[PDB]
Amino acid sequence: RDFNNLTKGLCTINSWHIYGKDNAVRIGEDSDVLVTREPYVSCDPDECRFYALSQGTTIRGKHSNGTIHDRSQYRALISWPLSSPPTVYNSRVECIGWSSTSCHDGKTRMSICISGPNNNASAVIWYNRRPVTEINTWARNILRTQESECVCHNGVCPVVFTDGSATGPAETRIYYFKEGKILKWEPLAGTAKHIEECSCYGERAEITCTCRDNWQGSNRPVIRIDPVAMTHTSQYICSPVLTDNPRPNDPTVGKCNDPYPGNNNNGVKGFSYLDGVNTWLGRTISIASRSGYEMLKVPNALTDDKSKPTQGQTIVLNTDWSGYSGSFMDYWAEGECYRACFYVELIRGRPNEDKVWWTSNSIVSMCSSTEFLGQWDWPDGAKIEYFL
Amino acid sequence: RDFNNLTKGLCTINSWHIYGKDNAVRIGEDSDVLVTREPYVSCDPDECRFYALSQGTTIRGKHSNGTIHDRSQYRALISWPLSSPPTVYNSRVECIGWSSTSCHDGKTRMSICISGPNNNASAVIWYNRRPVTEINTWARNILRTQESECVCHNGVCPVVFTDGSATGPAETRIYYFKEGKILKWEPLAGTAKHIEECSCYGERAEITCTCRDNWQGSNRPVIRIDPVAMTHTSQYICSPVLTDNPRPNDPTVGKCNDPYPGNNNNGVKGFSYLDGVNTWLGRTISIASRSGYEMLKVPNALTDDKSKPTQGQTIVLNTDWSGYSGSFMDYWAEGECYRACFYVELIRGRPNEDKVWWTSNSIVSMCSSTEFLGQWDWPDGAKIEYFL
Amino acid sequence: RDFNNLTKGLCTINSWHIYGKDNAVRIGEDSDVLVTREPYVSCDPDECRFYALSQGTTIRGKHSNGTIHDRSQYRALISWPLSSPPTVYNSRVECIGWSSTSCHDGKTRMSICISGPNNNASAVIWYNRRPVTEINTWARNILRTQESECVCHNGVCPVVFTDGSATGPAETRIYYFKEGKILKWEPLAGTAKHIEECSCYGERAEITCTCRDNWQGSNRPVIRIDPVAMTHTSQYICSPVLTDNPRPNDPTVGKCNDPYPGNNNNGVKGFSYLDGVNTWLGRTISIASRSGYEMLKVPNALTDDKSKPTQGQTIVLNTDWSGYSGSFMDYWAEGECYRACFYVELIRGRPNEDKVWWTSNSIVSMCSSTEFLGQWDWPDGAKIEYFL
Amino acid sequence: RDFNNLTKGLCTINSWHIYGKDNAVRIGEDSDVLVTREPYVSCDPDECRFYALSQGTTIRGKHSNGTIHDRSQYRALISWPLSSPPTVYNSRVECIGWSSTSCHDGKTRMSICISGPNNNASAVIWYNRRPVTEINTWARNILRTQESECVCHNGVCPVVFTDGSATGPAETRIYYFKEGKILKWEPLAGTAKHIEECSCYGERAEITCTCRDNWQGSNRPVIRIDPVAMTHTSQYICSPVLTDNPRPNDPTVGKCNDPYPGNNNNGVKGFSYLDGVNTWLGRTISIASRSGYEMLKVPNALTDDKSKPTQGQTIVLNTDWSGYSGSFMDYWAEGECYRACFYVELIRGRPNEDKVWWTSNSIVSMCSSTEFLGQWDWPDGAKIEYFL
Ligand SMILES: *[C@@H]1O[C@H](CO)[C@@H](O[C@@H]2O[C@H](CO)[C@@H](O[C@@H]3O[C@H](CO[C@H]4O[C@H](CO)[C@@H](O)[C@H](O)[C@@H]4O)[C@@H](O)[C@H](O[C@H]4O[C@H](CO)[C@@H](O)[C@H](O)[C@@H]4O[C@H]4O[C@H](CO)[C@@H](O)[C@H](O)[C@@H]4O[C@H]4O[C@H](CO)[C@@H](O)[C@H](O)[C@@H]4O)[C@@H]3O)[C@H](O)[C@H]2NC(C)=O)[C@H](O)[C@H]1NC(C)=O
Ligand SMILES: *[C@@H]1O[C@H](CO)[C@@H](O[C@@H]2O[C@H](CO)[C@@H](O[C@@H]3O[C@H](CO[C@H]4O[C@H](CO)[C@@H](O)[C@H](O)[C@@H]4O)[C@@H](O)[C@H](O[C@H]4O[C@H](CO)[C@@H](O)[C@H](O)[C@@H]4O[C@H]4O[C@H](CO)[C@@H](O)[C@H](O)[C@@H]4O[C@H]4O[C@H](CO)[C@@H](O)[C@H](O)[C@@H]4O)[C@@H]3O)[C@H](O)[C@H]2NC(C)=O)[C@H](O)[C@H]1NC(C)=O
Ligand SMILES: *[C@@H]1O[C@H](CO)[C@@H](O[C@@H]2O[C@H](CO)[C@@H](O[C@@H]3O[C@H](CO[C@H]4O[C@H](CO)[C@@H](O)[C@H](O)[C@@H]4O)[C@@H](O)[C@H](O[C@H]4O[C@H](CO)[C@@H](O)[C@H](O)[C@@H]4O[C@H]4O[C@H](CO)[C@@H](O)[C@H](O)[C@@H]4O[C@H]4O[C@H](CO)[C@@H](O)[C@H](O)[C@@H]4O)[C@@H]3O)[C@H](O)[C@H]2NC(C)=O)[C@H](O)[C@H]1NC(C)=O
Ligand SMILES: *[C@@H]1O[C@H](CO)[C@@H](O[C@@H]2O[C@H](CO)[C@@H](O[C@@H]3O[C@H](CO[C@H]4O[C@H](CO)[C@@H](O)[C@H](O)[C@@H]4O)[C@@H](O)[C@H](O[C@H]4O[C@H](CO)[C@@H](O)[C@H](O)[C@@H]4O[C@H]4O[C@H](CO)[C@@H](O)[C@H](O)[C@@H]4O[C@H]4O[C@H](CO)[C@@H](O)[C@H](O)[C@@H]4O)[C@@H]3O)[C@H](O)[C@H]2NC(C)=O)[C@H](O)[C@H]1NC(C)=O
Ligand SMILES: *[C@@H]1O[C@H](CO)[C@@H](O)[C@H](O)[C@H]1NC(C)=O
Ligand SMILES: *[C@@H]1O[C@H](CO)[C@@H](O)[C@H](O)[C@H]1NC(C)=O
Ligand SMILES: *[C@@H]1O[C@H](CO)[C@@H](O)[C@H](O)[C@H]1NC(C)=O
Ligand SMILES: *[C@@H]1O[C@H](CO)[C@@H](O)[C@H](O)[C@H]1NC(C)=O
Ligand SMILES: *[C@@H]1O[C@H](CO)[C@@H](O)[C@H](O)[C@H]1NC(C)=O
Ligand SMILES: *[C@@H]1O[C@H](CO)[C@@H](O)[C@H](O)[C@H]1NC(C)=O
Ligand SMILES: *[C@@H]1O[C@H](CO)[C@@H](O)[C@H](O)[C@H]1NC(C)=O
Ligand SMILES: *[C@@H]1O[C@H](CO)[C@@H](O)[C@H](O)[C@H]1NC(C)=O
Ligand SMILES: [Ca+2]
Ligand SMILES: [Ca+2]
Ligand SMILES: [Ca+2]
Ligand SMILES: [Ca+2]
């Protein structure tokens, strides 16, 4: 009821615990579950919810055939209660569109959806369930944004957007909203070469986004934002623990201000918590495919170009499929520090499990513990063969 | 919590953005979705909802066979959350009946449903979820009303009703309600020859309804209402951009106070925002069939009998089916002016897609932007062949 | 928030309008609708709801075979929103049992359910969602009650119960509860010979119940209750318009203090509003079967043993099935007088439509209008053949 | 809104009445009902709810094959409204895990779920819908807890946990939480030899848990807790009415401080209300199988090693299956004493009804009456043959 302010620092991440899990495609085999992809989690002052881009069909309906494709008039951003499946009957539509981001500012929620053809797309910014601002395509080639939650600090919420090429120079802007209205915007600055899909968090009045260079880097771009001054910088993560996918095998020395060459024109959405000795990177286990997921503690990963892992945790075993991951935190929990959390998307169907005609996913989420807890692995758990 | 007053004027409509979309018949192929028709949208001070006349069946049930017919004992007015499908489990029944209108007055909602045989029909007016007033048929031939939201101004809400012939002179009355009770009623005055289905909005303490002459005019009737004085007038739209369907091809000169001859005994429910230079008309693209939908900016359309389009926007392409459209606005949004919005009904099944035995629809809604946004088209999206 | 008091008299019933309708068995053919019977309606200060005794199955499930039988461990009293079908997902269970009654007292709701074997049954009285009092069988032969709403007056709510024979003398008691606790109880007094299923209402601090003599009368018993004094009397309705079913054809002269002979050992639950010149009786049209339903205005029906109809209204045509009916009113509506209302149960399945193995129903409800409205008939509307 | 305090004593249990019943597997044959097991009931200050460990599937889906197994990544603790079935659409997830307990403290709810492999498991304690404390396995062999509600007294809520062998010495600890944080913990003391599954209640500021010795006793262990002093003791029940299953036939003399030999390495979760002359024990009727359930009044059962039944009540007949039972009470009901209540789990599927591939259950619950009520039996009621 007054605007939230990033007042705390992160607690110390010594291991991760299960927070939420869906079992969406399992239950989906016999329930009216919606086909989704590009999920994320976001919290209000009184509840946290699971979010995704709907495809406008149930998994078992006939229109599910074809949902490998990313953009269409039948997609929407829906939220549903924590750890329940996206069900036709329990979801709330936030806005109509095929790219999105959302964050609550302490007083109410801002949601952003984008739709259009590839060359004549637009964003409309919803604040308190109503449309307030609308932005049009600047470079006329798939205007897109984060695909996970943004963060606010005393009313100002910055969002990162890219319009242009995913295979060479694009035009990225950082927009600063306050109550749904534009306060200012900046073109990208700093040394990062291409930005796609920022996964962001804040603490001690500073905002950190770990994004994806789709053009040429197996190491990830980092944008750091001042929300009072409204300025930013960008860099790449220095460490040789490369975290994008597909990617080359890990080196001995890394790169802070240039892409690491290896794979070109591809990638995945990912994240990291960067906090000096307390730094944890997440990544796929496969260097070739979106298979498995681990978390790795790599001290000073951002600055030390020779930093190697100190500790780890396996979240999905390499035989199972993962997909996109991103960061969130509940800024309204009691306690002295912010607890780090993340989700991982578990994609099922095409392109890897080609004997079905659909593509859907479930979610697993995790948050930090200061204890050293034992680990388990958290796979989707459906058997594709039941859908035949 | 005190009665709402039309205090503002319209913002400037420079283009339209997606507000809501259902994907109802797509999801309906495998979910418990109700068969509807004659939809509309209406807002409360804290939420906006989607509304329709139910048929009392799921699309995929066996009783769906036969729902081409308009009037029966199994129909009802239902509202459900914005952009969700009308589902057996998520809908709220407002009243029992086969014609309806509804509007919130700032303190609570008035809903009106009509039922009966053709010659012995009646309306009962619900205020705050309870029945308060009841009106009986005056001309004993299908007593009907708006099929979209009415509007109030400091407690008084006028509703337009026609009883009689749809193929020659009928008796139309304007009723003025305050808290569900009748304050006054008037027979139709002015030059309009036949009234059916008013689509209404208000601004600066004046109410505008664009209706359908089913008898003999391809140009539309307009009733303008003073809610303080409780009086009205009627006229036709002057412009040669004819907006009813079926209709003759557009002329060079139009008619302000007489019907334009061409098609007789037929039509569709439609709307317009009439605001001097800021005027936009909506219509089907086909002059013969309810196929496609466009919006056209036609300065001074109401008064200038030679007015031609200045700008446009395509909402449904001509290969797809549309059907009824109507106007709404959220009178309780923050900001200096009222934002114009509309819905379009996308009818599927009989009479055009004769290989199925049912008739249902979905909704698409749009609201104004002052920006010049790019366009996309918004078709229903189901494949009839999956229902065979 | 203080106890409700019957302060008003009835308005003048000049005709009846639709209030609610279910279309339950229609929608039930393809939705998860529960098998019910013995329905009724009851209102709170802020909403009115539909109520019934569940069978513990969906209409289309396999356990529906056998639901002709009245008493079992799988039945429960459920309420759901007005004019929606009893759905597995939208119903609220009030208490577990095979006979019930319920009424709100201004502060909260009292619900009573009975279960057991035929000879060792018991009632438990729930007040504010919790169990408070429990009564055991006195005559050890199906302890039963109203099967519709009771009524309260400044906290005291009387309920009528019969334990014993349905084919000769039973023991009927009137119990007076206040906050779920027993204040007093009385054995039946007056001239009525057998009581089953009271359908009750109140006005001007007096309570009227019209019940069913299952032993030997085609004319109905009437109990009148003083809730301040906590006393009652009973009589039969004087008029020759016999309203039970099965029944003999109507006579010329009737009986005030004795049963009218004709049919023995059978009947149906029914009701009447008894208010001098303003008196309306409801009944089946068939004298042999539960088919059709009409309402008949019969001045002074209670006292004049020669009273004949003055006006009428048909609610279900004789070709369709009806079943039980009962009275309710919304005691918390605005206005000077109480509006009379009623429901009728539309039974489908065994014993009359023997080609299916289940028995279920839907509801139609109606309330008074002072206007003279036109009529329509309101049948269930399912086609049994779709269930084969 | 201030912490609850166990201020009252128990009322006198003279017989038991139905409180809630599910009919879950009956309705499950044609509805989207979840596969559960290990149920229990727990109340808040304004409502009571039904709780269970989900399997992540609908009964009728294909992933139900295999749900005989107890631990996996697809299980979760869900609550749903009283006497409704656990439905995919109506359940709320409390936490992710395969062992659990929960209790409300007057201000909000604490929930505890455990997951992991058998040797590297962990608990995370949720308070007010958020994760607060996390405990790791101490003996590295299935860290488990109560499987029913815990109880609080002025903010402090003790929970009992066992880590280790279920077939010889394990390490049991009593933990005392206040607002989700650990205040203190104790290893087991007293004479009980092995603890599994405590079923607990409190009155007059003292907490009583009746548990299961899985190692070697047909008589049950009892832990009594002081929540102000935070200390406990343990004993076995003295009476020869043995209440575990499988068990030997009842003796003449019993044992207070040693296990009664007979069956080794097996058992079931059960409970008792121990209150001097007012003492009631519940048990399976079969000494060999989980079939039937009765309640038996056995004065001073805890202290008198020769105590025999005085009165009884049959809850499930011996031909039907039962399974786990446990205690609850609504500490926020009006009145002078606490009313005793219990649930019984009715297991259907494998291992006893081997012609299906799944294992699920329904619930029946009962609470005390001071009246002497008649009895009925409350079986699950599904027919397995409909699932073939
Ligand atoms: C009970 O529960 C507890 C809690 O979970 C369990 O304890 C945990 O066990 C985990 C598994 O062993 C363990 O995680 C590992 O931690 C290593 C840290 O160890 C180093 O430091 C510590 C302290 O100094 C020393 O003890 C240790 O000797 C080491 O010095 C990480 O190094 C591990 O990650 C690496 O291995 C895994 C496979 O094990 C890889 O998938 C991962 O990517 C890492 O290795 C690749 O990348 C590095 C960095 O570039 C390369 O050096 C390496 O060669 C690999 O490179 C190839 O592979 C990658 C990916 O395939 C590819 O990109 C690249 O090109 C190459 O092909 C691992 O994270 C936890 O730390 C530990 N937790 C605690 C608190 O103890 C316990 O075991 C459980 N079990 C039981 C039975 O009780
Ligand atoms: C990216 O996004 C942007 C935003 O959408 C796109 O820009 C928009 O593009 C639209 C499509 O071209 C455009 O809409 C048209 O606007 C015309 C206005 O133009 C006139 O004025 C402007 C300014 O003076 C001039 O630039 C221009 O030269 C003109 O002078 C409208 O006239 C258009 O509508 C008419 O055409 C369509 C088909 O294009 C018809 O369906 C429509 O009904 C109109 O034509 C019929 O009716 C008129 C009036 O009676 C007749 O004159 C005409 O002959 C037609 O009559 C027949 O057809 C009807 C219906 O079938 C029938 O009843 C009758 O009997 C006859 O049979 C059209 O609306 C937007 O204005 C423009 N927006 C902006 C801000 O720029 C951009 O293109 C996108 N694309 C890309 C690739 O980036
Ligand atoms: C438009 O809408 C309006 C509003 O609905 C319609 O107007 C209404 O029309 C109704 C149908 O005609 C009408 O209802 C009838 O009212 C009669 C009252 O009439 C008497 O008084 C008035 C005023 O004095 C006079 O005008 C009139 O001439 C009469 O004197 C009732 O008598 C009618 O009920 C009886 O008839 C029906 C069939 O019509 C029976 O089912 C019913 O049970 C009644 O008859 C049986 O019972 C009586 C009493 O014992 C016996 O006398 C009689 O012989 C029958 O007995 C047999 O049948 C029963 C049941 O089967 C059985 O038990 C027994 O043993 C015997 O076998 C009827 O109710 C409304 O009053 C009228 N409303 C108004 C405000 O005008 C209008 O028509 C609509 N239509 C159009 C086309 O516009
Ligand atoms: C209407 O409703 C009312 C209310 O329900 C009904 O009234 C109730 O009826 C119940 C059934 O008869 C009755 O319950 C029984 O109560 C006995 C208490 O009786 C003793 O005390 C009273 C007062 O002094 C005397 O009247 C009476 O004569 C006795 O002295 C219990 O003893 C009964 O339980 C035992 O029997 C059942 C079968 O009936 C067993 O299943 C149960 O486990 C008990 O017996 C076993 O265990 C004991 C203890 O060790 C052994 O002594 C015994 O030999 C059995 O041992 C074998 O079996 C067990 C389990 O199989 C196994 O472990 C062991 O190894 C051995 O193999 C029973 O509980 C209610 O008390 C009564 N209520 C009231 C208020 O009256 C009325 O009937 C209804 N019906 C009608 C038609 O109106
Ligand atoms: C955030 O900071 C502003 C001052 O910068 C203050 O007014 C506001 O109330 C703060 N947030 C909260 C929750 O107090
Ligand atoms: C999906 O669609 C393609 C063509 O659009 C068709 O070949 C394929 O068989 C479809 N899948 C199914 C299961 O029908
Ligand atoms: C509408 O106008 C009346 C006076 O005409 C005023 O009392 C009322 O409060 C106004 N509405 C609002 C929301 O203030
Ligand atoms: C619809 O009903 C008609 C007759 O009422 C019948 O010919 C037709 O086949 C029905 N449709 C279906 C799919 O049964
Ligand atoms: C009902 O009557 C009592 C006095 O008899 C009064 O206290 C109570 O408040 C009355 N009900 C209402 C709603 O005022
Ligand atoms: C209902 O049950 C009876 C025997 O209990 C059986 O004959 C009948 O066929 C059943 N109905 C159906 C449709 O199975
Ligand atoms: C419980 O006891 C404490 C004092 O021991 C008191 O503060 C608290 O308010 C009590 N609970 C209630 C509901 O009053
Ligand atoms: C369950 O799974 C086993 C093997 O995992 C298989 O033999 C069995 O037939 C399955 N049950 C069904 C009904 O498919
Ligand atoms: Ca890349
Ligand atoms: Ca026309
Ligand atoms: Ca009778
Ligand atoms: Ca044992």
Tab-separated table of N, CA and C in Angstrom, chain A residues 170-224:
chain	number	residue	atom	x	y	z
A	170	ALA	N	20.801	-5.767	-32.961
A	170	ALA	CA	19.402	-5.446	-32.748
A	170	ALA	C	19.397	-4.106	-32.021
A	171	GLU	N	18.268	-3.473	-31.763
A	171	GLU	CA	18.174	-2.269	-30.979
A	171	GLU	C	17.460	-2.593	-29.687
A	172	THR	N	18.203	-2.580	-28.604
A	172	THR	CA	17.672	-2.836	-27.272
A	172	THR	C	17.415	-1.549	-26.462
A	173	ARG	N	16.292	-1.351	-25.792
A	173	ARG	CA	16.090	-0.165	-24.967
A	173	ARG	C	15.688	-0.581	-23.567
A	174	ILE	N	16.118	0.199	-22.591
A	174	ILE	CA	15.674	0.048	-21.217
A	174	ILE	C	14.649	1.176	-20.993
A	175	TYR	N	13.391	0.793	-20.662
A	175	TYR	CA	12.258	1.696	-20.382
A	175	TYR	C	12.022	1.781	-18.894
A	176	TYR	N	11.660	2.940	-18.321
A	176	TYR	CA	11.449	3.028	-16.874
A	176	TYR	C	10.000	3.467	-16.669
A	177	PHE	N	9.131	2.631	-16.123
A	177	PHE	CA	7.731	2.939	-15.962
A	177	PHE	C	7.441	3.310	-14.526
A	178	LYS	N	6.436	4.136	-14.303
A	178	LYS	CA	5.978	4.432	-12.968
A	178	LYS	C	4.470	4.613	-13.126
A	179	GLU	N	3.720	3.735	-12.443
A	179	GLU	CA	2.264	3.580	-12.558
A	179	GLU	C	1.791	3.321	-13.986
A	180	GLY	N	2.518	2.538	-14.762
A	180	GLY	CA	2.088	2.243	-16.132
A	180	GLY	C	2.530	3.306	-17.143
A	181	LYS	N	3.082	4.454	-16.747
A	181	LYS	CA	3.410	5.561	-17.663
A	181	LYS	C	4.918	5.555	-17.888
A	182	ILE	N	5.406	6.026	-19.026
A	182	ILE	CA	6.828	6.055	-19.309
A	182	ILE	C	7.428	7.283	-18.678
A	183	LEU	N	8.490	7.086	-17.937
A	183	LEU	CA	9.248	8.162	-17.353
A	183	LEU	C	10.435	8.617	-18.186
A	184	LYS	N	11.109	7.645	-18.812
A	184	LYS	CA	12.319	7.818	-19.599
A	184	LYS	C	12.636	6.517	-20.381
A	185	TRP	N	13.474	6.484	-21.436
A	185	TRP	CA	14.015	5.235	-21.974
A	185	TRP	C	15.421	5.587	-22.505
A	186	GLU	N	16.271	4.551	-22.546
A	186	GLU	CA	17.672	4.590	-22.941
A	186	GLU	C	17.930	3.501	-23.984
A	187	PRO	N	18.718	3.711	-25.050
A	187	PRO	CA	19.297	2.645	-25.822
A	187	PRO	C	20.333	1.866	-24.962
A	188	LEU	N	20.676	0.617	-25.281
A	188	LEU	CA	21.688	-0.182	-24.596
A	188	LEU	C	23.050	0.511	-24.606
A	189	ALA	N	23.745	0.465	-23.494
A	189	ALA	CA	25.097	0.994	-23.449
A	189	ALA	C	25.987	-0.121	-22.924
A	190	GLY	N	27.285	0.120	-22.704
A	190	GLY	CA	28.185	-0.839	-22.085
A	190	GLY	C	28.749	-1.683	-23.183
A	191	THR	N	29.408	-2.785	-22.794
A	191	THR	CA	30.047	-3.659	-23.772
A	191	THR	C	29.255	-4.853	-24.250
A	192	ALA	N	28.015	-5.145	-23.832
A	192	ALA	CA	27.328	-6.359	-24.305
A	192	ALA	C	26.897	-6.265	-25.778
A	193	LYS	N	27.025	-7.315	-26.616
A	193	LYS	CA	26.769	-7.181	-28.047
A	193	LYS	C	25.346	-7.461	-28.542
A	194	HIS	N	24.516	-8.159	-27.761
A	194	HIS	CA	23.170	-8.554	-28.199
A	194	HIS	C	22.460	-9.012	-26.955
A	195	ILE	N	21.211	-8.582	-26.805
A	195	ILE	CA	20.381	-8.842	-25.600
A	195	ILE	C	19.046	-9.510	-25.958
A	196	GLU	N	18.627	-10.503	-25.234
A	196	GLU	CA	17.447	-11.281	-25.519
A	196	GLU	C	17.011	-11.725	-24.124
A	197	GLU	N	15.728	-11.742	-23.763
A	197	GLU	CA	15.329	-12.434	-22.523
A	197	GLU	C	15.976	-12.205	-21.125
A	198	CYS	N	16.090	-10.966	-20.636
A	198	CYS	CA	16.580	-10.754	-19.294
A	198	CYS	C	15.768	-11.315	-18.159
A	199	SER	N	16.596	-11.979	-17.332
A	199	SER	CA	16.153	-12.621	-16.105
A	199	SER	C	16.699	-11.716	-14.994
A	200	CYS	N	15.812	-10.960	-14.290
A	200	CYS	CA	16.283	-9.962	-13.326
A	200	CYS	C	15.899	-10.112	-11.830
A	201	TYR	N	16.662	-9.479	-10.922
A	201	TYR	CA	16.382	-9.383	-9.484
A	201	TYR	C	17.007	-8.083	-8.967
A	202	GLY	N	16.610	-7.630	-7.770
A	202	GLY	CA	17.211	-6.495	-7.103
A	202	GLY	C	17.420	-6.747	-5.604
A	203	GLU	N	18.368	-5.983	-5.079
A	203	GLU	CA	18.739	-5.886	-3.680
A	203	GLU	C	19.578	-4.615	-3.558
A	204	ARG	N	19.608	-4.105	-2.335
A	204	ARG	CA	20.212	-2.837	-1.926
A	204	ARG	C	20.174	-1.700	-2.950
A	205	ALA	N	18.957	-1.481	-3.455
A	205	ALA	CA	18.590	-0.465	-4.430
A	205	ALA	C	19.298	-0.516	-5.770
A	206	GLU	N	19.586	-1.722	-6.235
A	206	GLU	CA	20.294	-1.924	-7.480
A	206	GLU	C	19.627	-3.111	-8.155
A	207	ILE	N	19.535	-3.089	-9.492
A	207	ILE	CA	18.882	-4.184	-10.235
A	207	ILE	C	19.853	-4.915	-11.143
A	208	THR	N	19.880	-6.220	-11.089
A	208	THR	CA	20.733	-7.071	-11.899
A	208	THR	C	19.976	-7.990	-12.851
A	209	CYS	N	20.198	-7.887	-14.148
A	209	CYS	CA	19.628	-8.798	-15.135
A	209	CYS	C	20.721	-9.629	-15.855
A	210	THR	N	20.543	-10.942	-15.991
A	210	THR	CA	21.479	-11.830	-16.670
A	210	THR	C	20.649	-12.174	-17.894
A	211	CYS	N	21.155	-11.891	-19.108
A	211	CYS	CA	20.387	-12.097	-20.349
A	211	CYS	C	21.008	-13.087	-21.298
A	212	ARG	N	20.506	-13.131	-22.537
A	212	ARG	CA	21.046	-14.065	-23.539
A	212	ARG	C	21.498	-13.299	-24.799
A	213	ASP	N	22.753	-13.468	-25.156
A	213	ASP	CA	23.259	-12.964	-26.398
A	213	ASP	C	22.852	-14.005	-27.429
A	214	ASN	N	21.863	-13.871	-28.308
A	214	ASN	CA	21.630	-14.934	-29.282
A	214	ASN	C	22.644	-14.926	-30.437
A	215	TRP	N	23.223	-13.774	-30.802
A	215	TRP	CA	24.247	-13.689	-31.831
A	215	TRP	C	25.541	-14.515	-31.683
A	216	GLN	N	26.421	-14.311	-30.687
A	216	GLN	CA	27.723	-14.969	-30.674
A	216	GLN	C	28.421	-15.214	-29.352
A	217	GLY	N	27.798	-15.528	-28.220
A	217	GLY	CA	28.537	-15.667	-26.980
A	217	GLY	C	27.997	-16.819	-26.147
A	218	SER	N	28.871	-17.721	-25.721
A	218	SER	CA	28.453	-18.763	-24.794
A	218	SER	C	28.493	-18.383	-23.316
A	219	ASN	N	29.112	-17.223	-23.088
A	219	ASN	CA	29.115	-16.544	-21.793
A	219	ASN	C	27.932	-15.577	-21.852
A	220	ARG	N	27.278	-15.267	-20.725
A	220	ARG	CA	26.098	-14.389	-20.703
A	220	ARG	C	26.321	-12.903	-20.391
A	221	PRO	N	25.553	-12.013	-21.055
A	221	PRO	CA	25.477	-10.582	-20.817
A	221	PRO	C	24.836	-10.181	-19.505
A	222	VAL	N	25.238	-9.030	-18.941
A	222	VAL	CA	24.745	-8.649	-17.624
A	222	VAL	C	24.484	-7.176	-17.770
A	223	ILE	N	23.301	-6.713	-17.381
A	223	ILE	CA	22.930	-5.313	-17.363
A	223	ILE	C	22.736	-4.997	-15.887
A	224	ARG	N	23.316	-3.930	-15.309
A	224	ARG	CA	23.087	-3.537	-13.928
A	224	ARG	C	22.368	-2.176	-13.928
